[PDB]
Design a binder for this molecule. Sequence first.
Ligand SMILES: CCCCCCCCO[C@@H]1O[C@H](CO)[C@@H](O)[C@H](O)[C@H]1O
Length: 663
Amino acid sequence: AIKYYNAADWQALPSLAELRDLVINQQKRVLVDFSQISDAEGQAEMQAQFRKAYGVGFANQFIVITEHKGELLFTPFDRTEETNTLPHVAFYISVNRAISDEECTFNNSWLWKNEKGSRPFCKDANISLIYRVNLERSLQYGIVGSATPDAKIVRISLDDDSTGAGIHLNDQLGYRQFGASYTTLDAYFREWSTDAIAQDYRFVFNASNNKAQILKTFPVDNINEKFERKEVSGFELGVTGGVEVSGDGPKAKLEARASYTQSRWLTYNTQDYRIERNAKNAQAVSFTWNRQQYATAESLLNRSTDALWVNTYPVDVNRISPLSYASFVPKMDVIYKASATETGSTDFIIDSSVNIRPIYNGAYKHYYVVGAHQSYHGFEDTPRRRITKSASFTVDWDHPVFTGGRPVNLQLASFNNRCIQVDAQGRLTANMCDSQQSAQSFIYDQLGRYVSASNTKLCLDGAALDALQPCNQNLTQRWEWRKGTDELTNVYSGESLGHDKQTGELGLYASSNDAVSLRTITAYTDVFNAQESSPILGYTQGKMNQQRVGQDNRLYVRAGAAIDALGSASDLLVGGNGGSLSSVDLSGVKSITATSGDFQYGGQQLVALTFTYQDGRQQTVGSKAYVTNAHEDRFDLPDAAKITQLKIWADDWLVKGVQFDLN
Ligand SMILES: CCCCCCCCO[C@@H]1O[C@H](CO)[C@@H](O)[C@H](O)[C@H]1O
């Protein structure tokens, strides 16, 4: 049931929430058509409205929108072919390309190219992939040298949790035999052309301009053949944090108070292939799965000589691993960054391909005089054909999600609690509050400015309160709340934002009068469900890192006389480098008890965590043998509660405290 839409009709457009509800909640498959628009100006306008509304744009004529893993899935074409922790836009890009017989066709023979004809070397060859994309902001957190970056992020990846079907070339590898059309005494007389495999699989990532640079990727370098392992690619972003470290709520200025490690799980099983990483420059990087094991036709020979009366296929096709033609599922993670103040747009292109390689071997007839025989050989300089499928998406660096802040409103208490709202021209009015109206949403940024969420280029300016103004560095655009009151003050003049109780007109005042109120109420416009969690066990000292509990549902630790580090994976440990690695199962945990006190080797420390499970079993990390004047904080998990996130406080040497979030 595809719900067709002619974009030309909107030149008179549904919000993101509306689209997600129709596609995700109502499982409706949507098809947006841009090919009916009459001219370039009209197309550019709608394209601009489309991406401004949904956070992503395309230049393609058709866009199919479906659901995938709880997010929107965009399938563009031209012809008939965590949120509580980090604000972000997540979606997927689908790519499906059928490889035609013509595209898989090669000569039946190599030695006799123009004689034996040609045939398709693959059956139902296909490329079906799904790319996960996240648009998000990272704030600077930590000391210069070991801090998270202050940067707008575009993260693209092919991971275990959202992967598409993969690349297919053949179900099985068959062959055909051929022979010289002339007499032979000492020369090649027979040949076998085997169905094609992938000499390589390649994925190229590039950005359309220099506004974006590659920050990190996974793999970070080359990966050898016969490499089998589930890897984790973690990227640490500075975030504003919640109640555990930002006691001001909606009035808190955009500031990093913790870091968060967003992880992508990547399963590798390279077998015959080695993975070669190549970063040509700051905008482009490619990952190529190249045959390393049994890479030549010669290597496939399972016999070398025979008498002339033997006519047997001299190849052992079982030496070829199935990921070479049956099913291949790539895994990678690419993280692009742009400056904190970047503007405009950037396109990201993904080139996915398979280098199709037919296989040729021949038999050489040797003449000795008294006795003759044949020898088998492989031909390597034979034809290969790369079939590529590209896709691109456009990103606007001014999208509100890139501010890293949460939308909030400004309510005039004495004016029937109305919300300040901005129209297209930037004029201000006061209307009934409505969370579904972005025109009432603002981001309270780093400078203390109130940036319109519906147009990040405009700001609340004391210089002219009749309309928002192009954001700048002037103090007239920075606001500061007076603690203990509902009064919002202007940094430049020190006055308070007041509103006439009857007309709603805005102005700056030294104090309220009979006709004017200085009471401004602000609230988050997004509805956030309460997060249940244990108290902070231990001490709230040092930096805090947040990590989601992995699929393996285990807590990783390095400890000795105290607790050196903790993490959701052995490769994502936070804390010092001492202690010895250990692991704790989180399923069945009924209660957790932390031990803190005077540490034998200095100061106060969290020295141990004891976990008690439903069956009574207990496991402890750290020790109680090097602490005196100890104190025990015990947390009992609510019935059926499961640990899903970890908040870890640590300094350069030890974990200082931890908090466990539930469900
Ligand atoms: C941190 C200062 C430790 C001084 C001597 C400690 C002897 C106990 O053992 C030590 O405990 C440390 C803390 O967990 C670990 O980091 C060390 O690897 C471990 O050997």
